[PDB]
Ligand binder design. Structure first.
Ligand SMILES: O=c1[nH]cnc2c1ncn2[C@@H]1O[C@H](CO)[C@@H](O)[C@H]1O
Ligand SMILES: O=c1[nH]cnc2c1ncn2[C@@H]1O[C@H](CO)[C@@H](O)[C@H]1O
Ligand SMILES: O=c1[nH]cnc2c1ncn2[C@@H]1O[C@H](CO)[C@@H](O)[C@H]1O
Ligand SMILES: O=c1[nH]cnc2c1ncn2[C@@H]1O[C@H](CO)[C@@H](O)[C@H]1O
Ligand SMILES: O=c1[nH]cnc2c1ncn2[C@@H]1O[C@H](CO)[C@@H](O)[C@H]1O
Ligand SMILES: O=c1[nH]cnc2c1ncn2[C@@H]1O[C@H](CO)[C@@H](O)[C@H]1O
Lengths: 237, 237, 237, 237, 237, 237
């Protein structure tokens, strides 16, 4: 057991899906996993392990922010033998051509956090996803008739930033979505030699936004999880 | 309702106690509050509002890390009229004379995060607590026969830092405890003109540690909450 | 003696008051101390020692700026056994709700200097005063019928800043006054294990360039000094 | 023409391969392109245009370092309508599991340069390649019986670094190769809306200073070029 | 032979003139040197050695950018016994009172590059030329009746800067010319123990946008060269 | 009259010598100036005006540290018509081949202060002296038979640095003397449009730990002064 995960080696699959909202974890276990069993409850961060098409898979939330998700991904990798981490969340878009409910894959993750500089002697570390995981997600989405956009994400430390001009800079450089964990997970994966990928759905447009229905949201959410799970099987082949 | 708090103005008291672990929120409501009612459940971050000696009080967790707690404290202050935020958590000590279970009050909070530099044009912002709240907590602790140590805390972005030499630097400068939110809350309070204070109990010694019993832990925890609640009443006088 | 102080162990009290102006120190010794004697004059930085209500006390100027005052405070602490340092100076107001002849107590000090980053491995070090000294001053002021403000000061390296944008920034985050050394003094206090406190009277206000000595300004300056002297008495108890 | 390229719109193809050595560009045009013609010679930076399997293609050197290559790529994109840039060079290995005559594809590029921070408001910008170009190269290499590595490259400003500590840091975080311009090229691609990719063969290995041209090294260099050329063909489809 | 220079100790003189353009080195060899032989052409970076007034002199291009010239100057200093390096390049003017074709002597060089911060523990290293060398150039210029301003140059990493506002900051602080190597050459001279000086010809104006043409280039460029060669002779005496 | 100088336009000459020590200014006035009158003593910062070889000259202390001298040099330049400022101070040696009492001419000044970064958009501003002024000082010195090295000085913010390793970095890069004002005076001269030069007397050795005494101080300090005063006369001719 670790400080935040009361479990033992073997309890988690070597692949873990991680949503931000802790509540989505049991939903994924009930909706997509077979023979699921609870493997964690510390701090209410519910963890599960079951199978998908025979493949062993685990799901557990990471909390909002780089610091929070850095704790969980690190422990999973160093103490539970986890080899692949797939974050499945949501993000806000700054590009006009990026629409609500679009599925985005973060091959890279920009950030305003200082965690990677602290790791990389104050130089620029390109926090990137595992290439094969990226291509797997892309191929899985096409199979499900969904066109995923691949590019850069931006991991913000402040959901409510004091300076809104940064959003224009993000748009100018092609940022596909604004979220809060990707850069942290990518840093952890590199530090402890594991693989990671972040998949997000556009939940809002940080500017001229619109609206979606609850039915629309679950459909998109279930689409993202399907893509993630099928990408794992592709990776296995 | 805000993006992370599904409630309306008036649902929260003007004073909110905030533990890290979301599970501690309902414990405080059941153990210390009268006529408590649920006011939030978004993302499982349970919020409550009741009274203590007739005083209206709310309790809700903030999650681990500066980014997470920055979201909640900001929304509470700008949308629910909250005026005082008291974080009640735990920390690790680097000073030999600081013992397990000691109660520490963070008048100031050092950090390796970039949030305040982003706010203060890349200069040094002294993230500090409200002075009166500090003195109230100190006076409340003495009344309960507890001697609280007042000083600097250090808010780490990485619970598992790559460089352990920073701990010697922290010890050398008198850091009383290592936690992960204080500097963020202090920054938020200053940005939106509210008051904040962080009270922590030493749960471990980042070096030569020992052990505590579960009974010892709850006693200390209940002591900290008592100090926090009584400090509020003192502040009211 | 030291390279900047031509005196010997014993010549100073374990408590030292420090104005920036060497002439202000002579004025203070002359006005409030009994049996005063000059104990230093190197570079014209007059230091005196005498007693206040039978309590042995010293007063010495520290020049302008962090580089200057950090040299003197460091030497007093490591070579003359000084335990407490109380800077008594003036500051410029940035907040509109703060007017001239107002006593400010610096519980914390922000800065644009790099000295504390050089000390704290490029991270954010919260330069704070000693809690007890702050409380003693608050209580002494109250006993004198004075309502002092306790908050953040801003220590600038450039009295003549090349960019006035920072004043709006300071005001936004509640800085009470702008001076030039509190952050440096708090930094050496932490580095060499001593205690310090900065008390200031508002000399001028950026919110309308106005500052003109008078009987009431001089009355307020003397009140600050009485607060400093009376606060050490409370501490002795 | 531009200040560094004495040619006209049309002289270059919408795809440009770029080695660092001007002489390597002449070698490439001569070896793989049909109907090749020199379209630039300013400052000796030879650029050529011809066709590969009937596909119009260009190849031009970009000199050493981010400052140099960023001038050329920028001019090609904004003044010659160039859409894709593929840097074909050499890199030094830092990982032991990576040996000479190894094809590396830079999905991302870390750097110690300040150019991207200057662009991204002092924050972390993840300098990444175009996903499609990466995939096309991976697939072309596979069709040639070559197993290319896809990961992070490190772009250094100093070929002769004043501190060898960074190599251990790079190795720790999995950097595949050390070169001098990939991060700069990815930055201009993002700034001016074009697509780029860096492919490298491992010239030497810091893990034992060894690098000696030979028939098998030259064979591997040609394979890289074939991968570059064949990858653009796949993209065209 | 070094990694980028195919020559042997003795092929270069103890003094070397360096324009960024290889073709300009060739022109200097043919127009000012007697019995000039080619001693290097790796990567097309032409180097020559001959005599001037019976004095052995070398001339070799160094390419564009700090990373490029850092390589060449380092190899010359450590493997070919070169003691003095004189950069003879072009630059852009920011000040209105600096006309095209004017000669500037870089006593100092500001920069936006990080190379010197990496050498100087992230502090401010004033990249300055060798005093005697500067003095020789000023006298040599007077002896030729040519005008030459002595001051600061600014070595930029991006010829196409995304921040035009900085040109206002340069102008404000009296920057004479904008080029791309000086600060790097001075850093190398200091790191490896040699002496350097940069002389520049204002080839354009950042503001007005005038680009060198006519026969103004020849005479003006030949004036820069006459100063360099002659300043060397004065140095010998 | 300015905030820190109680004088009127005309009381100071267009040239001003400035030691950090006020008492040393007094000594210069009495020992080298004819008909020397006191024109300021605010905060004890003694200023004097008299003649040397019939030339009107002023001399005033500036205190220790960049923040202190920045105030005085600025006020002199903008409110008293001062055109040239010559700092005549002491410094510590880092190089073994620099003996006590040696004279150093600061052509450039490195620093660990942030003042120039604040002026230069966080980039590298090479703080350099005025060429002519440096040249005048070198000739004046030769005319007196006194030795004087011309080079870089390092302006430190902390006389008691917590980082001794940096002394190795200074030595490595040829730093001639460690003092505390040069880089600030040069920044001010450039910001407000005046000319400056810093001449120093090696009063100690960071390494060996020797402190100025005997009659070595007098003659050596008088040699520094003779150079400054005389360099001025050469400047006039
Ligand atoms: O617009 C957005 N900005 C920043 N983070 C967002 C946004 N939309 C979704 N998230 C993601 O949701 C949580 C915060 O509500 C974070 O976990 C973040 O990854
Ligand atoms: O030793 C410690 N280091 C860092 N944070 C700690 C420590 N002990 C308690 N916390 C606190 O507990 C959570 C992390 O487990 C964070 O919320 C932090 O504030
Ligand atoms: O407006 C102000 N800005 C900065 N420092 C000030 C101001 N007013 C008073 N001081 C204080 O007075 C001296 C400078 O005159 C400095 O010692 C500083 O602490
Ligand atoms: O070990 C290496 N370190 C840095 N750059 C290298 C290395 N090996 C090849 N290059 C690449 O070759 C040129 C320099 O010779 C640069 O263009 C760089 O990209
Ligand atoms: O306006 C200018 N900005 C930046 N560098 C310049 C400018 N003019 C000449 N150079 C110089 O010429 C090459 C680039 O063409 C670089 O070597 C640089 O030193
Ligand atoms: O070793 C030294 N380190 C730093 N400053 C020095 C040293 N020696 C002389 N000064 C100079 O003297 C004053 C401080 O005593 C400062 O004004 C500084 O410029």
């Amino acid at each position: 057991a670790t400080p935040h995960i009361n479990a033992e080696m073997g309890d988690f699959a070597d692949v873990v899906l991680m949503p931000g909202d802790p509540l989505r974890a049991k939903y994924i276990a009930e909706t997509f996993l077979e023979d699921a069993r609870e493997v964690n409850n510390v701090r209410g961060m519910l963890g599960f392990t079951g199978t998908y098409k025979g493949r062993k898979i685990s799901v557990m939330g990471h909390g909002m922010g780089i610091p929070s998700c850095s704790i969980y991904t690190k422990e999973l990798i160093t103490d539970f033998g986890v080899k692949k981490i797939i974050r499945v969340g949501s993000c806000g878009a700054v590009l006009p051509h990026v629409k609500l409910r679009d599925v985005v894959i973060g091959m890279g993750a920009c950030t305003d956090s200082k965690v990677n500089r602290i790791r990389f002697k104050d130089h620029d570390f390109a926090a990137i996803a595992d290439f094969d995981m990226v291509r797997n997600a892309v191929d899985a989405a096409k199979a499900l008739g969904i066109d995923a956009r691949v590019g850069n994400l931006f991991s913000a430390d402040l959901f409510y930033s004091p300076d809104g001009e940064m959003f224009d800079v993000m748009e100018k450089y092609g940022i596909l979505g604004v979220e809060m964990e990707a850069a942290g997970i990518y840093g952890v994966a590199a530090e402890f030699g594991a693989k990671a990928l972040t998949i997000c759905t556009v939940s809002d447009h940080i500017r001229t936004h619109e609206q979606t229905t609850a039915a629309e949201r679950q459909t998109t959410f279930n689409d993202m999880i399907k893509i993630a799970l099928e990408s794992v099987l592709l990776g296995d082949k």
